[PDB]
């Protein structure tokens, strides 16, 4: 279903990374954030929801997902929250990040290089599709 994303929080090099996975496509958005706050989650969601159609987000019960500040952003943006292939995309991202890490000074850049690669990479050879191509396809054919 074209509007469903899982959002999730993870750490590397003592920094915090917010990761959002589009479930049907495997397309990812992520960013290093300064602290694990609901405010940071809210800002991150507004950005995501302004770029893609976001209808439902799945998360866990961490306080950075259940606060007022997040709930206000979801109400404003028209996003439904649910609390409890995806654990899989998070591991793929960390592997990409590890591999490309030495091509960037800060982790924040490395993460965006990893996102670029994750979304442009092909599985199944020269003919295969990328997450980035799958998501615009899914969404494009929902508007028809």
């Amino acid at each position, epitope marked *: 279903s074209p509007g469903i994303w899982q959002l999730d929080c993870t750490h590397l090099e003592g920094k915090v990374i917010l990761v959002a996975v589009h479930v049907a496509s495997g397309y990812i958005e992520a960013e290093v954030i300064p602290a694990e706050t609901g405010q940071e989650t809210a800002y991150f969601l507004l950005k995501l929801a302004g770029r893609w159609p976001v209808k439902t987000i799945h998360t866990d019960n961490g306080s950075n997902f259940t606060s007022t500040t997040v709930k206000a952003a979801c109400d404003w943006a028209g996003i439904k929250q649910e609390f409890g292939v995806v654990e899989s995309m998070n591991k793929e991202l*960390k592997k990409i990040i590890g591999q490309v890490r030495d091509q960037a000074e800060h982790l924040k850049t490395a993460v965006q290089m990893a996102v670029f690669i994750h979304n442009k990479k092909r599985k199944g050879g020269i003919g295969g599709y990328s997450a980035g191509e799958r998501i615009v396809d899914i969404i494009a054919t929902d508007i028809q």
Partner: antibody
Amino acid sequence: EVQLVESGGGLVQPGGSLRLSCAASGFNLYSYSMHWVRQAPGKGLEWVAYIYPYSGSTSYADSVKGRFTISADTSKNTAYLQMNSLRAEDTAVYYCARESSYFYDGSYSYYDYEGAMDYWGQGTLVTVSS
Amino acid sequence: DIQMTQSPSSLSASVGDRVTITCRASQSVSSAVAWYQQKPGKAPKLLIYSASSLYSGVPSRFSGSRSGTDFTLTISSLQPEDFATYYCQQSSYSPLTFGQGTKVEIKR
């Protein structure tokens, strides 16, 4: 050209212990997922364990869970498989192998390896016998 | 615990032949299948990854393909150095598992 050189294999008695190591060069082992894969004499290949040091995650085949411990020392660019409570059926050649995430074609395209293992060591023989 | 059924176990061929080896996954594993070649007393060497991408440095006569849960490794024109054993692998689900192997031996 990278490489992997395993060592620490030999003869050992049932119930015994051994510690294999896998020394890497040409690349930073911290940055990759490393696997042990073994081959019993005249049999196929069986996945044993993995570690991705950068993120700290590890994983084990069911037939070794509880007995084996994978780990890495990044100062030495080396991975280890600690093998306790050995039985006859653990007799095998043990290989370490690297799993890259992706391949970059040098000209703006990227391909996912999806768990494939690009470089393997020559292997070390572990014989478990009374 | 996903099974890769590889066939045939053994295969007889001549230099110049078109050779094919198959691997059937016991349920979808998407494109996450690799192929390796192993000569006696040597380590496995990677040939093909992600179903159909050709590993750097491997001769073009090696190719891979997928249809659903069926994977095929093809050697378009068999060379003397290709007599060996070949293995498939899936890494779509932990634990990752291997086919049981296919020995390619010389016809006479």
